[PDB]
Amino acid sequence: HDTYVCLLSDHLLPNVIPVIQAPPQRVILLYTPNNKERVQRFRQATESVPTEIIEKQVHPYQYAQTQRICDEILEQFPNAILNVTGGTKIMALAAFDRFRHNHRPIIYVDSDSQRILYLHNGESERLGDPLTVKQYLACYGFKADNPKTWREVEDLFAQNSTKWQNQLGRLNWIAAQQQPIFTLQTGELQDLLLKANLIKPAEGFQFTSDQARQFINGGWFEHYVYSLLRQISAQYPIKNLTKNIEISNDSVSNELDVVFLYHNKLHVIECKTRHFTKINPMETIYKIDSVTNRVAGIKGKSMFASYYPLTQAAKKRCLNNSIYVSDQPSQLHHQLIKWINA
Amino acid sequence: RLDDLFIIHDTYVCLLSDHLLPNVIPVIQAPPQRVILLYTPNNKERVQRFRQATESVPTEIIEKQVHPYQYAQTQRICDEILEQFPNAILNVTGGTKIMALAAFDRFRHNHRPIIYVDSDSQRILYLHNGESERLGDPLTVKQYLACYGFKADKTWREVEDLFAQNSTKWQNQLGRLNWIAAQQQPIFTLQTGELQDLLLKANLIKPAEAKNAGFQFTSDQARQFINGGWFEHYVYSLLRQISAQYPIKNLTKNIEISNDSVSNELDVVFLYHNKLHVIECKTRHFTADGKINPMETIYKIDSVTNRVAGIKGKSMFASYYPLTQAAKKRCLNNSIYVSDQPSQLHHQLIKWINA
RNA sequence: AAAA
Numbered sequence: 001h002d003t004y005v006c007l008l009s010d011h012l013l014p015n016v017i018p019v020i021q022a023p024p025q026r027v028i029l030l031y032t033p034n035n036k037e038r039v040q041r042f043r044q045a046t047e048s049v050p051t052e053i054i055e056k057q058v059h060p061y062q063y064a065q066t067q068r069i070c071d072e073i074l075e076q077f078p079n080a081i082l083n084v085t086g087g088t089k090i091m092a093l094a095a096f097d098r099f100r101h102n103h104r105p106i107i108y109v110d111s112d113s114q115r116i117l118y119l120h121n122g123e124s125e126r127l128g129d130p131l132t133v134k135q136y137l138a139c140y141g142f143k144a145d146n147p148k149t150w151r152e153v154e155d156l157f158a159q160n161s162t163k164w165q166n167q168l169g170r171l172n173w174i175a176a177q178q179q180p181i182f183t184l185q186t187g188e189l190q191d192l193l194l195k196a197n198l199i200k201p202a203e204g205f206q207f208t209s210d211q212a213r214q215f216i217n218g219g220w221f222e223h224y225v226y227s228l229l230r231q232i233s234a235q236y237p238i239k240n241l242t243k244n245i246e247i248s249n250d251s252v253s254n255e256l257d258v259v260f261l262y263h264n265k266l267h268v269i270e271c272k273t274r275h276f277t278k279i280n281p282m283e284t285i286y287k288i289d290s291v292t293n294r295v296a297g298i299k300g301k302s303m304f305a306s307y308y309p310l311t312q313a314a315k316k317r318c319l320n321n322s323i324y325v326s327d328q329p330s331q332l333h334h335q336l337i338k339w340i341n342a
Numbered sequence: 343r344l345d346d347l348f349i350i351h352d353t354y355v356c357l358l359s360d361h362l363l364p365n366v367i368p369v370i371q372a373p374p375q376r377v378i379l380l381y382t383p384n385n386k387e388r389v390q391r392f393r394q395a396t397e398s399v400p401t402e403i404i405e406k407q408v409h410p411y412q413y414a415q416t417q418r419i420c421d422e423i424l425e426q427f428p429n430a431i432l433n434v435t436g437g438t439k440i441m442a443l444a445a446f447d448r449f450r451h452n453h454r455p456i457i458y459v460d461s462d463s464q465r466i467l468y469l470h471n472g473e474s475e476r477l478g479d480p481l482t483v484k485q486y487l488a489c490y491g492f493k494a495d496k497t498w499r500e501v502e503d504l505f506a507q508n509s510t511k512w513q514n515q516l517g518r519l520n521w522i523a524a525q526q527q528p529i530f531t532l533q534t535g536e537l538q539d540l541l542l543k544a545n546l547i548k549p550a551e552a553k554n555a556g557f558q559f560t561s562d563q564a565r566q567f568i569n570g571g572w573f574e575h576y577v578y579s580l581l582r583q584i585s586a587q588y589p590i591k592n593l594t595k596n597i598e599i600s601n602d603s604v605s606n607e608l609d610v611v612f613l614y615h616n617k618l619h620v621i622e623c624k625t626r627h628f629t630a631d632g633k634i635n636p637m638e639t640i641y642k643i644d645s646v647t648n649r650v651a652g653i654k655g656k657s658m659f660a661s662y663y664p665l666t667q668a669a670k671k672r673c674l675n676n677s678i679y680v681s682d683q684p685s686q687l688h689h690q691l692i693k694w695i696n697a
Numbered sequence: 698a699a700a701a
């Protein structure tokens with residue numbers, strides 16, 4: 001754990017995981033032209049860990065120049081260890097060659113099997129779960145900004161989602177548009193919202209508060225999904241479970257409905273339905289695909305959870321985009337367990 | 343010279359992975375006698391994409407299974423390949439680093455040629471001798487899409503040029519007519535002026551009431567043209583001009599791209615330096631207040647172009663209407679080139695295509 | 698093709 005040599009590239013996670021697990025004295029970061037901002041991401045991700053960071057520039061596609069930099073590093077730090085997981089194959093082949101020639105340890109992080117491979121001796125080790133959500137987001141340039149009676153309604157809405165589909169969808173729309181006075185047919189649902197004090201009659205009905213409006217504006221379903229994951233957390237080791245995280249990189253901001261870490265992979269659920277004529281899921285699928293790839297990277301996992309049934313086309317695009325889909329709140333607990341395992 | 347290497351070296355060994363392009367480009371350029379495809383478990387569909395991409399160039403194809411994360415086992419398979427085909431050449435661009443390190447090691451030990459495809463500089467690097475060669479441009483749009491499992495399914499030119507040149511001064515009038523055309527509102531008002539005279543003279547609008555208190559489109563094709571179609575033609579016509587000096591390939595408008603499960607419509611696509619270029623230039627999504635809302639379009643561009651064109655694919659968002667700072671910042675964040683100033687588009691297209 |  002003396003000197004750790006990392007090759008920086010699009011995905012910093014496999015360089016950061018070993019440094020958080022077992023802090024070395026020194027990290028040598030091999031960065032490439034126009035990517036010095038990756039050095040700053042690496043510092044931000046490892047801020048919690050006292051460690052000296054040395055930066056060295058190499059060309060992504062120059063075998064000989066990478067061989068020369070590794071030779072220089074091994075002269076100055078003979079007890080160096082190489083993380084060969086990052087970089088181009090040119091960078092990685094060059095560095096492997098010089099570290100092998102000097103009989104040095106060489107590690108590769110396999111996130112599929114959650115193992116560190118020791119390429120020098122063929123051995124391996126299970127990874128821990130060292131990452132927080134803060135550290136994971138930092139690797140992608142992102143930082144975070146941010147009643148008893150109503151939980152009962154949330155469970156009844158979830159259990160009755162098929163038969164109250166249209167009424168709840170319509171109330172979501174009304175709440176989204178901030179339409180101050182609205183009609184609702186007499187029935188179990190109107191009685192329930194009146195008894196729960198979510199709606200009151202107009203001097204027609206109105207929401208009893210902005211909080212009540214937010215709750216009917218798909219807020220109930222966001223809390224339902226979060227509350228299933230708190231239950232599931234009791235039996236599966238989900239980490240850093242958070243609702244309504246607001247993340248920025250200084251150029252864009254994204255809101256994420258529910259996020260957690262499991263086996264060092266960020267899991268993102270989209271379960272706000274207030275984007276979307278009705279509800280328009282196609283615009284939501286494109287957003288999930290775009291944002292989750294930028295925020296959670298290639299090993300990140302995305303789910304689209306809905307109280308309203310999705311069309312065949314929407315389900316086919318989700319399958320095509322590797323987005324797990326639940327449009328049956330009755331089945332969500334079982335589906336969350338299936339998704340998390342996988 | 344790659345044609346030369348494939349006369350002396352009969353057998354091309356490549357490692358299959360998410361991006362088949364760097365294995366396919368050398369095979370289309372210079373067809374070898376035999377290809378050995380190293381595929382991994384649950385990814386036999388990559389063998390089928392490779393066959394489909396190289397259908398125009400039938401060779402002998404041998405398939406061999408390897409584990410993505412087993413160094414010693416990949417070393418043994420490469421040893422076996424080199425025993426049976428001693429004149430093998432390795433394309434080390436594909437695969438995991440474990441696959442690639444294992445194969446490199448055995449091919450280096452046997453003093454074999456080893457190539458790596460650099461799409462940034464458009465070069466084949468010969469890792470055995472430090473030499474390199476410019477790639478050609480034999481790749482078609484059909485072959486490119488096959489690597490990602492996809493298949494491809496009047497008087498008014500004067501008006502088009504005047505709209506492009508006057509986009510700043512007619513911004514609001516043209517935006518408003520785009521909205522009307524999008525909503526299919528059949529009868530509309532227009533202030534008297536240069537623009538009304540132009541549309542009347544071009545026969546794009548005709549009067550609908552006396553005293554020109556109302557107008558209508560002269561046809562559905564006239565409506566389509568006012569529904570941002572004029573700007574789509576402007577963009578395509580800049581690419582025809584540029585084609586006269588730059589080797590843009592397979593320039594297409596309004597392409598339908600499908601796999602088994604999804605279809606995507608794309609405004610303008612071409613190949614340049616073996617990279618797929620996608621332009622979004624359709625104006626058809628408005629709010630209730632008639633403003634364009636670009637954010638939903640940016641997410642679609644980001645999602646579709648990454649699936650259809652892969653990580654080296656290039657996307658641009660072109661508009662005649664000014665975009666908000668936030669929309670421009672999301673485009674920058676998502677590596678989408680953005681133009682909201684038709685006066686600058688030619689220069690921006692040249693910058694974009696040359697990175 | 699810069700954790701495949």
